[PDB]
């Protein structure tokens, strides 16, 4: 499992994982950072599953073709090699790892299949696939076969199938892409028929896989196999006398292998992204690093110039490059896994007899066309999102303070706890993060299963089904309003509210929500949560003037719905009115809303007049007897002062102190009465001043001239001279501390952490360990600060083992930060109101 301060690496079991581990030993020897190499089964399928929760390795190795889908899913960090490092590698290897313009992985080596032949059995291997039956019959007379290779994977078989005219890919525009038109042409039919015939005529067996083919060739049973450079080591060991040469032709045309770049990507979930970078750039991608790996299992033609210059003298590498020259470079588009499913199913089915050759190819063609239309749909919607986001970001640059902190969907768990939950547990301390603006995106309803699981609302099963793939729920479903109906045509939901009444219809049946809520009337209707056929319907339905939402009961009052759909339902009276004084919508374009965050807001002012209390929305110049209703979100008010800034046009003309608040619990707020006298002005800002975090780090910090992690600036024990570049939007006298934050989960259901009945409750504990700087005088714009500082040993790890004590096997630690934090008296805008 991933941990701060060490590296986990995944690579396939056919590559040089033991040599890679030797690189990792050198790293640890120079660096103190332990590196673990693993080769899980089906790693290319496991990765997107586990990385979607925030698990998986720090670094994943695979051929470049899968990485686009990973990147599109947010699973990969953009890598940041400088031009000097890029120049060390062959320039066009970088194109394999570039996706929508960005570099998403490091290229390591170019791979292609070759024909490998036993020179004692077959000094003159056939050029042609056509020669293979007659050759096999002849060798069968002395107990040998002509050719064995992996028939289970289309990486190996498709080159035959596409040989007779056919590119599997097309340059479509800007990019190599999957070819849909003419997948089942006469050339492909001829290739796959040829293969099926080799099987039916008993020159090959449909069950032959990678292990069977390898053991056969390496024990001298078969004169030929097809494989990549990685296979050469086990051949050398077996002492077979072998050559590597050009793939056979079919119908006079080359067998065009797939050309893959073995590539190293950094998991977005990694808190070790700088370490991963150092390992890959300065340890792996060096002559010594690649040599260690290559000496375990050969890499092929490596991306690193200096080392490839040695390798290209080997005739086996020359043969590999000759096949790669004739091959098809794989796209890295997201539809690549669906392509491979299609083409994998086709060969298996045709080879096993499950389908005729033409039915096999027809269904592949239909799958590939379906995948392409989905890609075209997505790209249209990703453009839509692109531009809404772009307006919202432009608006933020133009209209918010320069060093303002903004977020959007370790911290992921805490965002999720805010978004997926309701009431007291959802009051997360965003001010700790110096959060200023929260962006919400209405379309994240489609991502709500992950958000709900990560925020502890639902179980692993509800999130994405159990082992078999059963039990997933739909957490949120939007229902646009068309007259007196709310409809989701896709999901076949119709809600009719005509005739002052509600009828819910899903497909053909009438369904009875557990509850319906109406906003803004606040009417509610309790129902059974079932459909008329007797099946469960565990959903709540909320209707608003413009939209409806169907929500799974466990997220029926999620704060996301409050913020994105304007549904104020809460299990805590008061909660929603409070929330909206802490999140103020200051802009909205497309389906993006930007909220101004303040931990301290006023959601109601009452004024006493003629002796009766009445809520007011503005205030005139003069005297008022007032009662302010305050929301504290996620942290307490402590030793605060309350002011009114009288405002004219955009200028503070007076500061008027109206109250002191020594304490207010964030879960138990109470009204404050004040009597005030206001001068003339266009408007009045209510402003709270108390201690809190200020400043934004500009570059990574340095300890003793060394570049360090802003989230883990010092290990426990360590000390040093520290230097920080800090931005502030105004001047401050600040203290500086080291502050640790622990984010962890606690299992609250299920028998163990692997049970699909498990849900996990996130928690964040923040504490200030040491004051390392007093009265530092920060000035508007940029600043350099330098102090000596030590993090005592025991601080981290002491807490870590107290968590153990309290939670045992329920505990899962997700992040531990040690951060430098400035603290000063800071202003919080609680509410601005007009004069008149």
Ligand X SMILES: OC[C@H]1O[C@H](O[C@H]2[C@H](O)[C@@H](O)[C@@H](O)O[C@@H]2CO)[C@H](O)[C@@H](O)[C@@H]1O
How crowded is residue 100: how many other Cβ atoms within 10 Å of its Cβ?
11
Contact of residue 66 among Ca ion, ligand X, none (CB under 5-8 Å per partner type): ligand X
- Report residue 459 as tokens: 């179980």
CB distance 108 to 117 below 8 Å: no
Is 52 known to sit in a ligand binding site?
Answer: no
Q: In the bound complex, what is the minimum distance in angstroms from residue 412's beta carbon to ligand X?
A: 27
- Report residue 39 as tokens: 């080769």
Q: How far apart are the first and last CA of the chain?
A: 60
The two most distant CA atoms of the chain are separated, in Å, by 114
Nearest-angstrom CA–CA distance, 565 and 285: 49
* Element of type H or E holding 801: helix 795-807
Of positions 28, 130, 153, 221, contacts ligand X by CB under 6 A: 153
Q: In the bound complex, what is the minimum distance in angstroms from residue 66's beta carbon to ligand X?
A: 5
Q: Which pairing describes strands 539-543 and 547-552: parallel, antiparallel, or unpaired?
A: antiparallel
Q: Which is nearer to ligand X, 263 or 763 (CB)?
A: 263
Q: Which is nearer to ligand X, 99 or 155 (CB)?
A: 155
Contact of residue 14 among ligand X, Ca ion, none (CB under 5-8 Å per partner type): ligand X
Angle at 689 between CA 687 and CA 694, to 5 degrees: 115
42: number of CA atoms within 13 Å, CB side?
Answer: 6
Contact of residue 434 among ligand X, Ca ion, none (CB under 5-8 Å per partner type): none
Contact of residue 194 among ligand X, Ca ion, none (CB under 5-8 Å per partner type): none
The sign of the CA dihedral 618, 621, 622, 623 is positive
Q: Does residue 180 bind ligand X (CB under 6 A)?
A: no
Q: Which is nearer to Ca ion, 329 or 605 (CB)?
A: 605
Q: Does residue 154 bind ligand X (CB under 6 A)?
A: yes
List the interface residues with ligand X, window 181-240 (CB under 6 A). Answer: 228
CA proximity to 538, closest of 512, 519, 564, 562: 512
Pattern 320-359, ligand X, x by CB under 6 A = --------------------x-------------------
CB distance 454 to 416 below 8 Å: yes
The phi and psi torsions of 563 (rounded to 5 degrees) equal: -80, -30
User: After which residues is the backbone of the chain broken at C–N > 2.5 Å?
Assistant: 409
Burial classification of residue 330, based on how many CB atoms lie within 10 Å of its CB (0-12 exposed, 13-18 middle, 19 or more buried): buried
Is 666 known to sit in a ligand binding site?
Answer: yes
Q: Which is nearer to ligand X, 204 or 477 (CB)?
A: 204
DSSP annotation of 119: T
Q: In the bound complex, what is the minimum distance in angstroms from residue 11's beta carbon to ligand X?
A: 10
Q: Which is nearer to ligand X, 44 or 184 (CB)?
A: 44
The phi and psi torsions of 380 (rounded to 5 degrees) equal: -65, -50
Q: In the bound complex, what is the minimum distance in angstroms from residue 158's beta carbon to ligand X?
A: 8
CA proximity to 785, closest of 723, 742, 731: 723
Q: Which pairing describes strands 242-245 and 176-178: parallel, antiparallel, or unpaired?
A: unpaired
CB distance 465 to 474 below 8 Å: no
Residue nearest to Ca ion (CB): 666
Contact of residue 155 among ligand X, Ca ion, none (CB under 5-8 Å per partner type): ligand X
Q: Which is nearer to ligand X, 47 or 242 (CB)?
A: 47
Q: In the bound complex, what is the minimum distance in angstroms from residue 152's beta carbon to ligand X?
A: 8
Q: Which is nearer to Ca ion, 70 or 666 (CB)?
A: 666
Pattern 102-121, ligand X, x by CB under 6 A = ---------x----------
Q: Does residue 260 bind ligand X (CB under 6 A)?
A: yes
Torsion (CA) 521, 527, 529, 534 in degrees, nearest 10: -140
Pattern 43-82, ligand X, x by CB under 6 A = -x------------------x-xx----------------
Is 427 known to sit in a ligand binding site?
Answer: yes
Q: Which stretch binds ligand X (CB under 6 A): 2-10, 151-159, 597-605, 703-711?
A: 151-159
* Element of type H or E holding 336: helix 336-352
Torsion (CA) 830, 603, 590, 594 in degrees, nearest 10: 20
Q: In the bound complex, what is the minimum distance in angstroms from residue 293's beta carbon to ligand X?
A: 13
Contact of residue 431 among Ca ion, ligand X, none (CB under 5-8 Å per partner type): none
Q: In the bound complex, what is the minimum distance in angstroms from residue 427's beta carbon to Ca ion?
A: 5
Quote the distance between the C-alpha of residue 444 and its chain's center: 14
646: number of CA atoms within 13 Å, CB side?
Answer: 15
Of positions 61, 67, 149, 155, contacts ligand X by CB under 6 A: 155
Q: In the bound complex, what is the minimum distance in angstroms from residue 13's beta carbon to ligand X?
A: 9
Residues making contact with Ca ion (CB under 5 A): 632, 666
CA proximity to 595, closest of 385, 442, 439, 445: 439
CA proximity to 457, closest of 536, 559, 535: 559
Q: Which is nearer to Ca ion, 75 or 630 (CB)?
A: 630
Q: Which stretch binds ligand X (CB under 6 A): 150-158, 544-552, 646-654, 705-713?
A: 150-158
List the interface residues with ligand X, window 777-816 (CB under 6 A). Answer: none
Per rule CB under 6 A, count of chain residues that contact ligand X: 13
Is 819 known to sit in a ligand binding site?
Answer: no
Contact of residue 695 among ligand X, Ca ion, none (CB under 5-8 Å per partner type): none
Q: Which is nearer to ligand X, 14 or 496 (CB)?
A: 14
Q: Which stretch binds ligand X (CB under 6 A): 148-156, 351-359, 597-605, 812-820?
A: 148-156
Contact of residue 153 among Ca ion, ligand X, none (CB under 5-8 Å per partner type): ligand X
Crossing angle (nearest 10°) for helices 186-200 and 357-399: 120
Q: Which is nearer to ligand X, 111 or 164 (CB)?
A: 111
Reduced to 3 states, what is the DSSP secondary structure of residue 634? coil
Q: In the bound complex, what is the minimum distance in angstroms from residue 568's beta carbon to Ca ion?
A: 15
Q: Which is nearer to ligand X, 228 or 601 (CB)?
A: 228
CB distance 215 to 240 below 8 Å: no
Q: Which is nearer to ligand X, 76 or 664 (CB)?
A: 76
The phi and psi torsions of 822 (rounded to 5 degrees) equal: -90, 140
Q: Which is nearer to Ca ion, 319 or 428 (CB)?
A: 428
Q: In the bound complex, what is the minimum distance in angstroms from residue 343's beta carbon to ligand X?
A: 8
- Report residue 575 as tokens: 């909660």
Q: Which stretch binds ligand X (CB under 6 A): 147-155, 416-424, 461-469, 518-526?
A: 147-155
Of positions 7, 12, 69, 690, contacts ligand X by CB under 6 A: 12
Q: Which is nearer to Ca ion, 287 or 665 (CB)?
A: 665
User: CA of 458: how far to CAs of 466, 564, 650, 818, in Å?
Assistant: 13, 20, 47, 30
Contact of residue 666 among Ca ion, ligand X, none (CB under 5-8 Å per partner type): Ca ion
Nearest-angstrom CA–CA distance, 247 and 241: 18
Q: In the bound complex, what is the minimum distance in angstroms from residue 160's beta carbon to ligand X?
A: 13
- Report residue 517 as tokens: 């809520």
Q: In the bound complex, what is the minimum distance in angstroms from residue 278's beta carbon to ligand X?
A: 25
Q: In the bound complex, what is the minimum distance in angstroms from residue 4's beta carbon to Ca ion?
A: 31
DSSP annotation of 241: -
Q: In the bound complex, what is the minimum distance in angstroms from residue 376's beta carbon to ligand X?
A: 22
DSSP annotation of 283: I
C-alpha Rg value of the chain to the nearest Å? 32
Of positions 14, 130, 274, 718, contacts ligand X by CB under 6 A: 14
533: number of CA atoms within 13 Å, CB side?
Answer: 8
- Report residue 390 as tokens: 């772009």
Residues that bind ligand X (CB under 6 A): 12, 14, 44, 63, 65-66, 111, 153-155, 228, 260, 340
Which residues line the annotated binding site?
Answer: 427, 632, 666, 669
- List, as residue ranges, the binding site for Ca(2+): 427, 632, 666, 669
């Amino acid at each position: 499992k991933i941990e701060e301060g060490k590296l986990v690496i995944w690579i396939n079991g056919d590559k040089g994982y033991n040599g890679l581990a030797e690189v990792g030993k050198k790293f640890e020897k120079d660096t103190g950072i332990k590196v673990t190499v693993e080769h899980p089964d089906k790693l290319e399928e496991k990765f997107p599953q586990v990385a979607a929760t925030g698990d998986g390795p720090d670094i994943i190795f695979w051929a470049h073709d899968r990485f686009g889908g990973y990147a599109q899913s947010g699973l990969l960090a953009e890598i940041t090699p400088d031009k000097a490092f890029q120049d060390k590698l062959y320039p066009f290897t970088w194109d394999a790892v570039r996706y929508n313009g960005k570099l998403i992985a490091y290229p390591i080596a170019v791979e292609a299949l070759s024909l490998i032949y036993n020179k004692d059995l077959l000094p003159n291997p056939p050029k042609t696939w056509e020669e293979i039956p007659a050759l096999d019959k002849e060798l069968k007379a002395k107990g040998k076969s002509a050719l064995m290779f992996n028939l289970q994977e289309p990486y190996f078989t498709w080159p035959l199938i596409a040989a007779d005219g056919g590119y599997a890919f097309k340059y479509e525009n800007g990019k190599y892409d999957i070819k849909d038109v003419g997948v089942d042409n006469a050339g492909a039919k001829a290739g796959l028929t040829f293969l099926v015939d080799l099987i039916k005529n008993k020159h090959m067996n449909a069950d032959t896989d990678y292990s069977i083919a390898e053991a056969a060739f390496n024990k001298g049973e078969t004169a030929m196999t097809i494989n990549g450079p990685w296979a050469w080591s086990n051949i050398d060991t077996s002492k077979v006398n072998y050559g590597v040469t050009v793939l056979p032709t079919f119908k006079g045309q080359p067998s065009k292998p797939f050309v893959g770049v073995l590539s190293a990507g950094i998991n977005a979930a990694s808190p070790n992204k700088e370490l991963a970078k150092e390992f890959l750039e300065n340890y792996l991608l060096t002559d010594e690093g690649l040599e260690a790996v290559n000496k375990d299992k050969p890499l092929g033609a490596v991306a690193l110039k200096s080392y490839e210059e040695e390798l290209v003298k080997d005739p086996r590498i020359a043969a590999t490059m000759e096949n790669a020259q004739k091959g098809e470079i794989m796209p890295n588009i997201p539809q690549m896994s669906a392509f491979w499913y299609a083409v994998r199913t086709a060969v298996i089915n045709a080879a096993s007899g499950r389908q005729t050759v033409d039915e096999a190819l027809k269904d592949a063609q239909t799958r590939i066309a379906a995948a392409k239309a989905e890609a075209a749909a997505k790209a249209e919607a990703a453009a839509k999102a692109a531009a809404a986001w772009e307006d919202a970001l432009k608006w933020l640059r133009e209209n918010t303070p320069e060093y303002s902190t903004a977020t959007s969907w370790d911290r992921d768990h805490i965002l999720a706890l805010f978004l997926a939950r309701d009431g007291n547990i959802s009051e997360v301390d965003f001010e700790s993060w110096e959060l200023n603006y929260f962006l919400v995106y209405l379309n994240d309803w489609a991502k709500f299963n992950a958000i709900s699981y990560l925020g502890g609302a639902i179980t692993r099963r509800e999130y994405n089904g159990d082992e078999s793939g059963r039990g997933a729920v739909t957490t949120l479903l939007p229902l646009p309003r068309y007259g007196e109906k709310y409809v989701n045509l896709y999901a076949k939901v119709i809600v009719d509210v005509s005739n002052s009444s509600v009828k819910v219809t899903v497909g053909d049946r009438e369904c009875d929500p557990l509850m319906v809520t109406f906003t803004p009337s606040g009417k509610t209707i309790k129902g059974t949560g079932t459909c008329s056929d007797g099946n469960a319907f565990p959903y709540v339905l909320h209707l608003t003037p413009t939209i409806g939402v169907l929500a799974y009961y466990k997220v029926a009052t999620a704060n996301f719905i409050k913020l994105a759909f304007g549904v104020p339902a809460s299990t805590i009276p008061g909660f929603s009115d409070k929330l909206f004084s802490n999140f103020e919508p200051v802009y909205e374009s497309g389906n993006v809303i930007v909220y101004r965050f303040t931990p301290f807001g006023i959601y109601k002012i009452e004024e006493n007049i003629n002796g009766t209390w009445k809520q007011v929305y503005n205030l005139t110049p003069g005297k008022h007897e007032l009662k302010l209703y305050i929301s504290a979100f996620g942290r307490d008010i402590e030793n605060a002062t309350l002011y009114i800034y009288a405002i004219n046009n955009e200028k503070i003309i007076e500061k008027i102190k109206i109250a002191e608040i020594s304490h207010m619990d964030y879960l138990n707020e109470y009204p404050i009465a004040v009597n005030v006298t206001l001068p003339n002005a266009t408007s009045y800002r209510f402003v709270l001043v108390q201690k809190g975090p200020i400043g934004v780090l500009l570059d990574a910090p340095k300890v003793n001239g060394e570049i360090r992690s802003p989230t883990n600036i010092l290990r426990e024990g360590e000390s040093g001279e520290i230097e920080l570049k800090v931005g502030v939007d105004k001047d401050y006298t600040a203290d500086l501390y080291l502050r640790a934050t622990f984010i962890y989960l606690v299992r609250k259901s299920g028998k163990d952490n692997e049970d699909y009945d498990a849900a996990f409750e996130p928690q964040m504990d923040v504490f200030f360990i040491t004051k390392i700087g007093e009265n530092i005088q920060l000035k508007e714009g940029e600043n350099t600060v330098k102090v000596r500082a030590e993090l005592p040993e025991g601080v981290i790890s002491s807490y870590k083992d107290e968590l153990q004590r309290k939670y045992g096997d329920k505990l899962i630690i997700r992040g531990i930060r040690v951060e430098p934090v400035f603290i000063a008296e800071k202003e919080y805008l609680m509410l601005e109101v007009s004069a008149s």
